[PDB]
Design a protein around this ligand. Structure first.
Ligand SMILES: [Mn+2]
Ligand SMILES: [Mn+2]
Ligand SMILES: [Mn+2]
Ligand SMILES: [Mn+2]
Lengths: 198, 198, 198, 198
């Protein structure tokens, strides 16, 4: 049974970049609903599968991807942020960034471009392509999860759904992006990056 | 050259169902940006077309549909609302509603279901199917316009993008839907409906 | 554990409308492959679900919809055809056709249009809308099944993937569509329709 | 005003890898039809744009992408093949292949996999990423063109729509893929690649 993970920090630990109201609603309501909805959908799929009901299985895909993706994306997102985040990585991750995007600053501009470029709801991602053995930026619509839909391993995700910033920044997503860089938990992004080595 | 249409009423004319802050941002920022962006995209398409650059034409489709759809959807949305709206239609529109959905109340439940059911950004619509000669409910993702993508003629649209309600109702879209019924401008929906007769 | 259903007739029974070579390849290769692939994908989804691996479940969705839909669609298709078929349906089904589409010929033109209009691979369908209690025509891309993706109950399906007609009709899909009316098993379509009333 | 390009060789010049019947139908029917359809759709878009009819412009998008992409993709495809082709590329292109994919054989396996993996109609492509300055393999659905929908520059394309191989290879697409390597015009792929450096 899937469960809602506790936030790694208090709801106001990211102020003033992302206000506590946002953090509380985003976690206790948005992520919470996805988890309960996911459990309900998985239950239905096990029944449809046991009866070999392919039509039911197909009809349940949108709900499974949306609530499942919602759980996957937010679980990673929380760890991607930290009160002591910000600045830039150091070591292998940093070297990969410069290698694949030219410079950290260039990388920031590219991931920002992908995030701001999302038309409708979605996420901007910095991922790792195991096949190519390099970093790659990608954008996903709605709650479609990065690995489940592209195969790329998620390192850093930026939620550009309006509920992730509208209460504080309104229609100006670029202001939201500019601010979030101040809280990126590079220690966690680095750990996720190294996990792809082994 | 496309232009931003004036709101048929003041920004606070729909209180308390949709607060004035929402109305001002939604109109002066969201709809406004779409119009200017549309004009810019149309300019680019005329050039690509003149040079017979099919690749450019294809690359510009997402922007044309999104900003074009944005202009189309919001232009209709404003007229779909009114300070003196609410209640239910009377005459042919009402008879069609009962005929195709059983009862006005049933119709309200169905269009609400379609609107609340949107995963991600989108719109709920009550449209007219000229081919079948009857009413039909449909949901569209992001800014995809109803007639341009489904052929159905738009009668009543419900914006379920989070920017349309988050500041007032937060994550609870159902509360937003319940409230919007109080401001539906049935006079305009009826006019749009009759225009399909001729 | 899904199995390939025996065809209701001999591979050359639909001659000369759909030749024996196509019938044999379509059943023994295309449909058979979807069946084998479906059993494999379902087994993997069983493992994913039991492990609570949401990423794997999501990654399996395209294969499940593609191969499962393949099994669903062709199973119905075989029963929708007959060597002693053709002509027109009678009783209630025919009444509905005239009611919902105007006449039998208008219905044919509409289903043909939807079928010839498919860009890429897909299917044309005559389905029943349980919510609206009336007939409805629809087109589905690739192997996306009617009920699983639209909620509509399938009554008559027309496979417009190129393997359904190329060997005999080459690029002229309209010729295939004209010929298939000669083998439509209205007895079966009627059963599916009446099974909707109950 | 777009025109159908003459084939660079005789219809039976690619025998026995791709037979003459397929080559003739593919060029004179499939590609020719896309050209005619494209000119028609572009003319309608010219009228829509001049009128400021955003709904019509949006409604024309599927036809424009489908027929325009058809023109783009096949035009490149013809030049990607040759009767005296086959073997392997040399110089820089070959260097990049080993660099980006490991070896020529690994590249072949990867392009083949992407091509055989297309569910429904589509294309497998070897393209150049100008942003990352490296080779990249990608698959496109139906006639969606590489550059117009992915920004990648097309170097080598493989049509996996069933009309590209069914008459000769029937359902065994892998056999088609194996055979096509014998007629790849590496001279042309090289030109497209070098044209990316400048
Ligand atoms: Mn979120
Ligand atoms: Mn809006
Ligand atoms: Mn088939
Ligand atoms: Mn082709």
């Amino acid at each position: 049974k899937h469960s809602l993970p506790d936030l790694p920090y208090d709801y106001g630990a990211l102020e003033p970049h992302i206000n506590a109201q946002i953090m509380q609603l985003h976690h206790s309501k948005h992520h919470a609903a996805a988890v309960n909805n996911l459990n309900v959908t998985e239950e239905k799929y096990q029944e449809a599968l046991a009866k070999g009901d392919v039509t039911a299985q197909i009809a349940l895909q949108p709900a499974l991807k949306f609530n499942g993706g919602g759980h996957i994306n937010h679980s990673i997102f929380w760890t991607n942020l930290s009160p002591n985040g910000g600045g830039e990585p150091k070591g292998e991750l940093l070297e990969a960034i410069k290698r694949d995007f030219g410079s950290f600053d260039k990388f920031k501009e590219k991931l920002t471009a992908a995030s701001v470029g999302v038309q409708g709801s979605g996420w901007g991602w910095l991922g790792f392509n195991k096949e190519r053995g390099h970093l790659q930026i990608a954008a996903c619509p709605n709650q479609d999860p990065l690995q489940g839909t592209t195969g790329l391993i998620p390192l850093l995700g930026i939620d550009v759904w309006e509920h992730a910033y509208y209460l504080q920044y309104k229609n100006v997503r670029p202001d939201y992006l500019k601010a979030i860089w101040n809280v990126i938990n590079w220690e966690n992004v680095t750990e996720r990056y190294m996990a792809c080595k082994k």
